Motif scaffolding. Structure first.
Motif, PDB file in Angstrom:
ATOM      1  N   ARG B 103       0.820  -1.197   0.000  1.00  0.00           N
ATOM      2  CA  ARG B 103       0.000   0.000   0.000  1.00  0.00           C
ATOM      3  C   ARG B 103       0.864   1.263   0.000  1.00  0.00           C
ATOM      4  O   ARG B 103       0.483   2.248  -0.607  1.00  0.00           O
ATOM      5  N   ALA B 104       2.036   1.162   0.634  1.00  0.00           N
ATOM      6  CA  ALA B 104       2.906   2.285   0.880  1.00  0.00           C
ATOM      7  C   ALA B 104       4.065   2.259  -0.118  1.00  0.00           C
ATOM      8  O   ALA B 104       5.100   2.948   0.046  1.00  0.00           O
ATOM      9  N   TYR B 105       3.865   1.522  -1.195  1.00  0.00           N
ATOM     10  CA  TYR B 105       4.776   1.409  -2.322  1.00  0.00           C
ATOM     11  C   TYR B 105       4.228   2.032  -3.581  1.00  0.00           C
ATOM     12  O   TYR B 105       3.047   1.821  -3.916  1.00  0.00           O
ATOM     13  N   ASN B 106       5.039   2.801  -4.297  1.00  0.00           N
ATOM     14  CA  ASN B 106       4.598   3.406  -5.601  1.00  0.00           C
ATOM     15  C   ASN B 106       5.443   2.831  -6.714  1.00  0.00           C
ATOM     16  O   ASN B 106       6.608   3.204  -6.842  1.00  0.00           O
ATOM     17  N   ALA B 107       4.875   1.921  -7.506  1.00  0.00           N
ATOM     18  CA  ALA B 107       5.633   1.225  -8.555  1.00  0.00           C
ATOM     19  C   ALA B 107       6.129   2.102  -9.742  1.00  0.00           C
ATOM     20  O   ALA B 107       7.081   1.704 -10.424  1.00  0.00           O
ATOM     21  N   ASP B 108       5.482   3.246  -9.970  1.00  0.00           N
ATOM     22  CA  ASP B 108       5.821   4.142 -11.097  1.00  0.00           C
ATOM     23  C   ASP B 108       7.252   4.642 -10.976  1.00  0.00           C
ATOM     24  O   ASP B 108       8.019   4.648 -11.959  1.00  0.00           O
ATOM     25  N   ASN B 109       7.596   5.079  -9.766  1.00  0.00           N
ATOM     26  CA  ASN B 109       8.885   5.672  -9.466  1.00  0.00           C
ATOM     27  C   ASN B 109       9.668   4.862  -8.435  1.00  0.00           C
ATOM     28  O   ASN B 109      10.718   5.296  -7.987  1.00  0.00           O
ATOM     29  N   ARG B 110       9.123   3.708  -8.054  1.00  0.00           N
ATOM     30  CA  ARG B 110       9.781   2.734  -7.163  1.00  0.00           C
ATOM     31  C   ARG B 110      10.138   3.358  -5.818  1.00  0.00           C
ATOM     32  O   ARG B 110      11.280   3.215  -5.304  1.00  0.00           O
ATOM     33  N   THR B 111       9.174   4.077  -5.245  1.00  0.00           N
ATOM     34  CA  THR B 111       9.410   4.682  -3.903  1.00  0.00           C
ATOM     35  C   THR B 111       8.568   3.991  -2.827  1.00  0.00           C
ATOM     36  O   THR B 111       7.545   3.296  -3.091  1.00  0.00           O
ATOM     37  N   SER B 135      15.439  -6.857  -1.917  1.00  0.00           N
ATOM     38  CA  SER B 135      14.426  -7.912  -1.845  1.00  0.00           C
ATOM     39  C   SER B 135      13.069  -7.405  -1.381  1.00  0.00           C
ATOM     40  O   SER B 135      12.028  -7.863  -1.887  1.00  0.00           O
ATOM     41  N   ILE B 136      13.064  -6.479  -0.416  1.00  0.00           N
ATOM     42  CA  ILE B 136      11.785  -5.870   0.052  1.00  0.00           C
ATOM     43  C   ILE B 136      11.142  -5.085  -1.077  1.00  0.00           C
ATOM     44  O   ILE B 136       9.922  -5.181  -1.329  1.00  0.00           O
ATOM     45  N   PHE B 137      11.961  -4.306  -1.781  1.00  0.00           N
ATOM     46  CA  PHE B 137      11.423  -3.502  -2.866  1.00  0.00           C
ATOM     47  C   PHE B 137      10.912  -4.404  -3.985  1.00  0.00           C
ATOM     48  O   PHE B 137       9.870  -4.115  -4.589  1.00  0.00           O
ATOM     49  N   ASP B 138      11.643  -5.491  -4.253  1.00  0.00           N
ATOM     50  CA  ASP B 138      11.221  -6.443  -5.287  1.00  0.00           C
ATOM     51  C   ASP B 138       9.866  -7.054  -4.924  1.00  0.00           C
ATOM     52  O   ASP B 138       8.951  -7.167  -5.764  1.00  0.00           O
ATOM     53  N   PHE B 139       9.726  -7.385  -3.643  1.00  0.00           N
ATOM     54  CA  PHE B 139       8.514  -7.997  -3.158  1.00  0.00           C
ATOM     55  C   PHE B 139       7.342  -7.053  -3.361  1.00  0.00           C
ATOM     56  O   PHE B 139       6.318  -7.486  -3.916  1.00  0.00           O
ATOM     57  N   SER B 140       7.484  -5.791  -2.925  1.00  0.00           N
ATOM     58  CA  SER B 140       6.472  -4.739  -3.153  1.00  0.00           C
ATOM     59  C   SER B 140       6.127  -4.554  -4.637  1.00  0.00           C
ATOM     60  O   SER B 140       4.930  -4.456  -5.009  1.00  0.00           O
ATOM     61  N   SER B 142       6.405  -6.771  -7.009  1.00  0.00           N
ATOM     62  CA  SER B 142       5.603  -7.930  -7.417  1.00  0.00           C
ATOM     63  C   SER B 142       4.150  -7.910  -6.921  1.00  0.00           C
ATOM     64  O   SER B 142       3.248  -8.306  -7.663  1.00  0.00           O
ATOM     65  N   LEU B 143       3.920  -7.434  -5.697  1.00  0.00           N
ATOM     66  CA  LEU B 143       2.542  -7.221  -5.199  1.00  0.00           C
ATOM     67  C   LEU B 143       1.809  -6.112  -5.897  1.00  0.00           C
ATOM     68  O   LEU B 143       0.622  -6.269  -6.194  1.00  0.00           O
ATOM     69  N   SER B 144       2.485  -4.979  -6.145  1.00  0.00           N
ATOM     70  CA  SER B 144       1.868  -3.885  -6.887  1.00  0.00           C
ATOM     71  C   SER B 144       1.242  -4.392  -8.190  1.00  0.00           C
ATOM     72  O   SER B 144       0.210  -3.861  -8.635  1.00  0.00           O
ATOM     73  N   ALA B 145       1.855  -5.415  -8.785  1.00  0.00           N
ATOM     74  CA  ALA B 145       1.419  -5.886 -10.083  1.00  0.00           C
ATOM     75  C   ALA B 145       0.078  -6.625  -9.965  1.00  0.00           C
ATOM     76  O   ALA B 145      -0.661  -6.747 -10.948  1.00  0.00           O
ATOM     77  N   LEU B 146      -0.236  -7.098  -8.752  1.00  0.00           N
ATOM     78  CA  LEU B 146      -1.482  -7.817  -8.517  1.00  0.00           C
ATOM     79  C   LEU B 146      -2.621  -6.837  -8.391  1.00  0.00           C
ATOM     80  O   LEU B 146      -3.780  -7.199  -8.531  1.00  0.00           O
ATOM     81  N   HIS B 147      -2.269  -5.567  -8.120  1.00  0.00           N
ATOM     82  CA  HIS B 147      -3.234  -4.516  -7.797  1.00  0.00           C
ATOM     83  C   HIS B 147      -4.352  -4.936  -6.819  1.00  0.00           C
ATOM     84  O   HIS B 147      -5.543  -4.856  -7.163  1.00  0.00           O
ATOM     85  N   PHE B 148      -3.957  -5.364  -5.627  1.00  0.00           N
ATOM     86  CA  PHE B 148      -4.923  -5.786  -4.618  1.00  0.00           C
ATOM     87  C   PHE B 148      -5.914  -4.719  -4.247  1.00  0.00           C
ATOM     88  O   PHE B 148      -5.533  -3.570  -4.089  1.00  0.00           O
ATOM     89  N   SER B 149      -7.173  -5.091  -4.085  1.00  0.00           N
ATOM     90  CA  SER B 149      -8.132  -4.217  -3.403  1.00  0.00           C
ATOM     91  C   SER B 149      -7.887  -4.326  -1.888  1.00  0.00           C
ATOM     92  O   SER B 149      -7.221  -5.288  -1.423  1.00  0.00           O
ATOM     93  N   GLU B 150      -8.453  -3.389  -1.130  1.00  0.00           N
ATOM     94  CA  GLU B 150      -8.435  -3.478   0.333  1.00  0.00           C
ATOM     95  C   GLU B 150      -9.030  -4.772   0.845  1.00  0.00           C
ATOM     96  O   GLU B 150      -8.498  -5.383   1.752  1.00  0.00           O
ATOM     97  N   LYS B 201      -1.298 -16.455  -8.949  1.00  0.00           N
ATOM     98  CA  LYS B 201      -0.238 -15.462  -9.155  1.00  0.00           C
ATOM     99  C   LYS B 201       0.343 -14.927  -7.868  1.00  0.00           C
ATOM    100  O   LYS B 201       1.161 -13.995  -7.905  1.00  0.00           O
ATOM    101  N   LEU B 202      -0.154 -15.425  -6.721  1.00  0.00           N
ATOM    102  CA  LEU B 202       0.313 -14.947  -5.433  1.00  0.00           C
ATOM    103  C   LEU B 202       1.752 -15.262  -5.200  1.00  0.00           C
ATOM    104  O   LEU B 202       2.176 -16.282  -5.682  1.00  0.00           O
ATOM    105  N   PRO B 203       2.511 -14.425  -4.448  1.00  0.00           N
ATOM    106  CA  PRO B 203       3.936 -14.729  -4.121  1.00  0.00           C
ATOM    107  C   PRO B 203       4.070 -16.158  -3.634  1.00  0.00           C
ATOM    108  O   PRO B 203       3.260 -16.601  -2.811  1.00  0.00           O
ATOM    109  N   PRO B 204       5.071 -16.895  -4.138  1.00  0.00           N
ATOM    110  CA  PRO B 204       5.247 -18.251  -3.609  1.00  0.00           C
ATOM    111  C   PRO B 204       5.521 -18.156  -2.136  1.00  0.00           C
ATOM    112  O   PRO B 204       6.095 -17.166  -1.666  1.00  0.00           O
ATOM    113  N   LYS B 205       5.153 -19.164  -1.359  1.00  0.00           N
ATOM    114  CA  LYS B 205       5.689 -19.156  -0.016  1.00  0.00           C
ATOM    115  C   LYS B 205       7.120 -19.631  -0.064  1.00  0.00           C
ATOM    116  O   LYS B 205       7.495 -20.459  -0.930  1.00  0.00           O
TER     117      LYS B 205
END
Ligand SMILES: CCN1C(=O)COc2cc(N(CC(F)(F)F)S(=O)(=O)c3ccc(C)c(C)c3)ccc21
Ligand SMILES: [Cl-]
Ligand SMILES: [Cl-]
Ligand SMILES: [Cl-]
Ligand SMILES: [Cl-]
Ligand SMILES: [Cl-]
Ligand SMILES: [Cl-]
Ligand SMILES: [Cl-]
Ligand SMILES: [Cl-]
Lengths: 10, 244
Positions: B103-111, B135-140, B142-150, B201-205
């Motif tokens: 939620r606190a990640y912006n994929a456009d500018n990777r912040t 790795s944290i940024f990579d993880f974010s 990859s989640l941004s790409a799922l575009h989760f709803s709340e 498409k969820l992150p592998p465990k």
């Protein structure tokens, strides 16, 4: 082993 | 569990999340255009490892506190025995924060949103754990790409926490049943909203696992470099969850 975690559960 | 009970569980989980989400999506979106200046970034990079560790441990502890609240409000969690509540939170609280981070990640500018503004991974240089940060940024990303709803993140994080495969559980059958009903809830919600394709498409465990393992390893390194700081300044809960 986890008293501070346990406390917040109460 | 009947269809009505599963429908009510979706509502219950979504509410528990709403009540403990700790930062409004609307606020986070609005603050994307607030980005650290060059001088501000330099300031962070010049910070001691000690100070940056100490700050991050405080913020992580705050997030983990909301996850404990989420758990306590989560249908069926307070029915589990003390041991199992502890085992699930010790393994899962950090995993939930990591998911919440998208939620606190912006994929456009990777912040990432940190201490009131967005910065890139360069902001965290003084931590001295380049692989973990990347790795944290990579993880974010990859989640941004799922575009989760709340609602999706509420149901998904419930499942990250209610995981019957965590070692040291007493009432495994009890945790299995909770997990299964939460899977039913997740699947019902996704089917209704035409989103079931995201499940595959969820992150592998092991992805979440590795991030948490790396956190523990880097903390051990830091603690050996600066043992006084941890006992003096870090939250006791943080030490208890992540120290050796
Ligand atoms: C350094 C150890 N660490 C991890 O291994 C797991 O990721 C973390 C998250 C947080 N946050 C916690 C909260 F975001 F949830 F609030 S943060 O202080 O706003 C933050 C946001 C973003 C980054 C990149 C960092 C480094 C920090 C704190 C610590 C870690
Ligand atoms: Cl830094
Ligand atoms: Cl603190
Ligand atoms: Cl867990
Ligand atoms: Cl964002
Ligand atoms: Cl993330
Ligand atoms: Cl997202
Ligand atoms: Cl959550
Ligand atoms: Cl679907």
């Amino acid at each position: 082993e986890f008293p501070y975690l346990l406390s917040l559960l109460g | 569990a009947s269809l009505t009970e599963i429908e009510h569980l979706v509502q219950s989980v979504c509410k528990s999340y709403r009540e403990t989400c700790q930062l409004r999506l609307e606020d986070l979106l609005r603050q994307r255009s607030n980005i650290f200046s060059r001088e501000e970034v330099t300031g962070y990079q010049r910070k001691s490892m000690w100070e940056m560790w100490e700050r991050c441990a405080h913020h992580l502890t705050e997030a983990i506190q909301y996850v404990v609240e989420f758990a306590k409000r989560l249908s069926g969690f307070m029915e589990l025995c003390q041991n199992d509540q502890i085992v699930l939170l010790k393994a899962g609280a950090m995993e939930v924060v990591l998911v919440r981070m998208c939620r606190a990640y912006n994929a456009d500018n990777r912040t990432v949103f940190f201490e009131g503004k967005y910065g890139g991974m360069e902001l965290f240089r003084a931590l001295g754990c380049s692989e973990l940060i990347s790795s944290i940024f990579d993880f974010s990303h990859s989640l941004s790409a799922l575009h989760f709803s709340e609602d999706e993140i509420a149901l998904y994080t419930a499942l990250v926490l209610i995981n019957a495969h965590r070692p040291g559980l007493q009432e495994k059958r009890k945790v299995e049943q909770l997990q299964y009903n939460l899977e039913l809830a997740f699947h019902h919600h996704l089917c209704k909203t035409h989103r079931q394709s995201i499940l595959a498409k969820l992150p592998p465990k092991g992805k979440l696992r590795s991030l948490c393992s790396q956190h523990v390893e880097r903390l051990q390194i830091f603690q050996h470099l600066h043992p006084i700081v941890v006992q003096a300044a870090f939250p006791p809960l943080y030490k208890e969850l992540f120290s050796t």
